[PDB]
Amino acid sequence: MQIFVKTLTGKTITLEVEPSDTIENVKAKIQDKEGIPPDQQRLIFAGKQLEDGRTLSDYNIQKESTLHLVLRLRGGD
Template sequence: MLITVKILQAQGKECSIEVTATDSISSVKELIARELDVPVDQQRLVFRGKTLADGQSLGDYNIGPGTKLHLVVKRSQDEKSGNFQKIPPQTTALWDQLKPVLSKHFKTEDVDKVIHHFQKEFESSISNLSLDDLERIAIYNLERRQQDSDSASSSS
């Protein structure tokens, strides 16, 4: 059977591999390593929000033909040790930006309660999104940020 593996961090990068339901997750990772040049020890396969265990088979997770698995690439040892360029935070947290706005509409003692409630609702909404949904949102925001940056530089 043919399944698709999509790398979440690489925009649109995916491959299709031929497997059987009895193939182990570790053997699938080896196929992925050959196809996508991602070392096995840096791979984490996700299906329906669950990380797939190396000792299990595709059949154990009811993975059939046409299924899409998501590949999360773990950071290499160089990245873990800090031997890479760090990206500085772009903005302050949304929650900090909300306080002055909410202070205009709520009593001071209620602002933290409202923010806490909003955080819980936000986390609940995000947890219901699929990995594909989150990827689309991230790509959209990155493209919008690039467009804003291009507009600002062309108007100066």
């Protein structure tokens, strides 16, 4: 399944993921493509930060959804 990720510089990358892929696997793909260590990735979808141990389905992420990569905020995790 394709999903999009808006990266830190404003470009958009496309990932091929399983329909219920884990968030950890998604971060692993982003690391390979963009170079960001998974521990430094913070992904937002539908106003929520995506969590390890969940899958894309937990968030109703589907074909051609767009996720946003962001920095860690002070006071955030």
